[PDB]
Symmetry: D2
């Protein structure tokens, strides 16, 4: 029976002790402490060696990425790539700390665009009329000048030209995940999440990749250079096989919608994830998948019955850097080659 007790600042500002104290502070501070424990359990599983039998079964993917004792799926909505959590996610991917990424179209394109031009701080209350008259697009309390997307068009159209040519003369069958690997190779910039993902053979799934600026560009491009196909069926096999042949899986899901459901549904194919942390502000009462508690996923078989999943009800821009500080960042040496 653990007693409630908050950090005592009479001790001074001892940051690690202050963070450790969230576990006995209560409400979402305690859920944060539980999330640190769940993620550290994923990491300590991941670093355990594969036995001969485990290695046999897990080798049954055709994937270039070396397999580990715990395959970690990291999912996040577009807004988090607009935010500075882009840097947090880039770090994890750069150091091979996670194994599969799932994001929406915005979460791909805004990473690449930030390599061409920055996003700026604003306010939620800025009025749409005056912004639109000035070509400034609003993302929460962030601002993206539309010139950013004009730079994106310039950068992307030559790649689209090459992709159709490789499709039609070299037999390439494009999928969202194959396109995202190509885009990461092209951006060729170490600040980019997708640069490191393709370098480290970390696949990125985004079944609705046409829902965004990338879609705008493909759409415009298709009038002059018709026939690009993006197949989502092959990518469904690819993500599902990541779960099916894992020794263990963990899910770290930031936000809701397709990124949350698609990771969870893949893990149903192995009868459930072993570890899971949600971080989002959605609420269950309207029945949405976004606001469903981890225990709903247990009824489907998406999380194992014997798992101890946790949801932190909070804006991930506040807690995800703190979570990484207390978990992956303390084990960085183990992830380096």
């Amino acid at each position: 029976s653990t007693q409630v007790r908050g950090y005592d600042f009479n001790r001074g500002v001892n940051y690690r002790a202050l963070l450790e104290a969230f576990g006995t502070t209560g409400f979402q501070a305690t859920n944060f402490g539980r999330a640190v424990q769940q993620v550290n359990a994923m990491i300590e599983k991941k670093l355990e060696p594969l036995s001969q039998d485990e290695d046999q079964h897990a080798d049954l993917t055709q994937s270039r990425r070396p397999l580990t004792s715990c395959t970690i799926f990291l999912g996040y909505t577009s807004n988090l790539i607009s935010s500075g959590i882009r840097e947090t996610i880039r770090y994890l991917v750069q150091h091979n700390m996670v194994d599969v990424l799932v994001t929406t179209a915005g979460g791909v394109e805004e990473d690449l665009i930030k390599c061409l031009a920055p996003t700026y701080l604003g306010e939620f209350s800025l009025r749409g009329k005056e912004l639109r008259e000035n070509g400034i697009n609003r993302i929460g309390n962030l601002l993206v000048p539309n010139e950013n997307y004009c730079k994106f068009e310039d950068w992307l159209m030559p790649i689209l030209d090459q992709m159709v040519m490789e499709q039609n003369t070299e037999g390439v069958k494009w999928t969202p995940s194959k396109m995202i690997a190509r885009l990461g190779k092209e951006i060729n910039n170490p600040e980019s999440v997708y640069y490191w993902a393709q370098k480290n053979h970390i696949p990125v799934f985004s079944p609705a990749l046409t829902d965004g600026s990338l879609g705008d560009m493909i759409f415009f491009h298709s009038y002059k250079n018709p026939g690009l196909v993006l197949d989502i069926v092959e990518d469904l096999r690819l993500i599902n096989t990541q779960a099916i042949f894992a020794k263990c899986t963990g899910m770290i899901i930031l936000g809701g919608g397709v990124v949350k459901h698609h990771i969870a549904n893949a893990n149903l194919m192995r009868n459930g994830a072993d570890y899971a942390v949600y971080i989002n502000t959605a609420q269950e009462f309207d029945g949405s998948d976004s606001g469903a508690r981890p225990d709903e996923a247990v009824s489907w078989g998406k999380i194992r019955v014997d798992a101890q999943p946790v949801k932190v009800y909070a804006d991930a821009s506040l807690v995800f850097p703190l979570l990484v500080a207390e978990t992956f960042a303390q084990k960085m040496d183990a992830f380096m080659h």
Copy 2:
């Protein structure tokens, strides 16, 4: 009493414009007239007032849609690659999957059955659970039922609703022969499948007037769902492909189809229930015409985490997705409560004109 205090609390006020509307609730001393009760939400305040504003926005869409036009039928079909005739207002209706598991399925089905909207957008669950409900029902439960006991009994939870695993076994038996035919048609009849084309096929096959997608294909209302693999239809396509390889679902052609629905519209309205892809994909299509003319959002998401789901309509104005001169409305509510009321006051009142 301190003089500055008195001056701060008892400050003079300007007179408000003469057309300012007073707050006043429905008076049950009149008895119960449900029409008058709903009309009274407009002057009740808070989200009741936004509901009244949403009635007005949707009634404006409908009245626009009912205006005659003269436009060349053959060129419209050619630029949109669609058999659907243009009207004076193209209405896009988007809804998340949970609402198809709820009884809002019936509400949506009624609108599509009577050809009252022009474009549907939903996620994968919002397709498959309409079809599965023609095979077996969904049941009432509670949000607090524990997942371990449910899982051990083969029962899956959707909010406070429940669906047995066996529903999906029936879905599998129904779907597998259709997937066989789709692969045969792709490989020997040149069909280039996309989600919308598959959803039209599935509605024709289910052949059941309780289904949204049966009515949608009958009435030539396309359904866009660019992540159609993310659910049970996905599971089935996946298992089927190891028995019968080769099905492809392209999303590029469906992007051309939805965007041209917005580009070549005379007017557009957006009615969006929930967040995620369904909200963003409709709004982004409408950026292609420099913005929708009318818009109603009904969802429970909040802006403060920067999510697109929680963004107010005025964020969409900044992008060009809603016109600067539109008067869009968001109702902050569970759509299971307010969408039937909204339909009662709008489309269902205009049923005569839709014949």
Copy 3:
């Protein structure tokens, strides 16, 4: 096992059938249907006769109000009196349909002020600077000209004069509930909730009655006419005895904060309410009493273990008129004398 099925508009717009269909529609529509059932159960208990033994025990209050088989506590936050739900609540109180009211200071004063001047529709986004420069106060998307409070001051100061005089020459010991009955008698207007409450011997509790414009006025008044006392201890005995000697109780609570906790805590004194409906938009995850589910109150003994309470997660301006339409309003003849 009840199947999900929504209202079919092919039947036409049959309003009562449409409302009845919320119960099988799911999510908060089903919780609304359950709330209709809980409230109708309060009403059908309330109309059951008191047996001789029940009548004996329930007569042990010194209260002028005739006792009934189910004592219904109605609680609501200030914003709902600013809104047109003021009319809904006035109707229930006018026809003796509820037995105890609990509200905050704003929920008293705005009822009285609406008898002097109206509240107007506005928008949530109106900016505070321009409003303040014009003396317009904002309540959500409603607007109250500050002249309304100047009219309140004019109306109220003579009553405060009389109350101190009766305190100091006639032995009157003021409490919030006694002041609210007096204010309702003085406003003498059938549009006012508190007019009907005092006429029908329905007590109104508001332990923090000084937190609002009423407080402002008492404060200003106390410089020229010092010594008014408002005792909250006596009002605590009064509300608790309403629960202790009830045959059955129901709680209908709109909103959170003190109105919710104070009704629930009174009912702990009888080992729990028999029926309960919450309607509010607060969420449980921060640990607040406002966002606690009814099942939290069960652990305290504030709701009986064998009750079937329900929370509707929604803005009460949308659902409370619908709830009243389906419950109290259909039994109006039984409440008339």
Copy 4:
């Protein structure tokens, strides 16, 4: 590609002012420096950015408070009826009851112990659970624990926290003799009890440096709680009055005490954790000076239902509760996560000046 479509999507943009701040998160290739990590929230966006803005607002309060003044000590005490000396910024700290059950109790206690704020406002639970924690602890649990089983074991739930019934039995034994003395002092020494005066007495009696209210009375920090009867202290006053009748708690005199704290301030700041009375009562006091100079809200309430709890700081500007020229901040978060971080970056950095 349709020309209007291209023009709508590829619209030119104005250049933003040169001092515009770029978004950029903390880079863990630097390793883990927690100070730099917290500083990085300012440029991370969404509520992380509001957290950084809240650090700045509170640091501005503190810096103002540390400015010297010359003001007549005797007249200030007479107009406020308070022994507390005036400083250059009077800070009001408000917090709902649940936060005293959480470990935020320790955070608040530290601030009051070091005399860093001037006025506390809390609800009844926020008083009594501080005192009870000096008798017996609160435990960690889960939100989903069922009330029937808990009730049958005599365990009471507060969110995901748990407190046994026996905690309140210990409270009863401790409190009853003190209530006896209060009635004796009212009836034969002329004491006119109010909530603040009772809370000062209870803090002196608990005599325990882990208690917020022990430190508050030692440092002459008044605690306002105008519905002090709404909780366990209420239960005890109630049961006690049938054994020893006559205790009165007046709220009118406490209204005079809190309002004069705002009226006679040089500057004020408001730090408000949660909603309800604690938020409204501090803000209303500050209307008496035509508005607070600085304000930080931390709560999870939303505006859309019109509640005062969910109102943004800009609503308070319309009333005169926050000055038109202030730059107030709300962080949309559970205070159990962000208040210790906020204190770490503000008051706890200034500990040297507060000695």
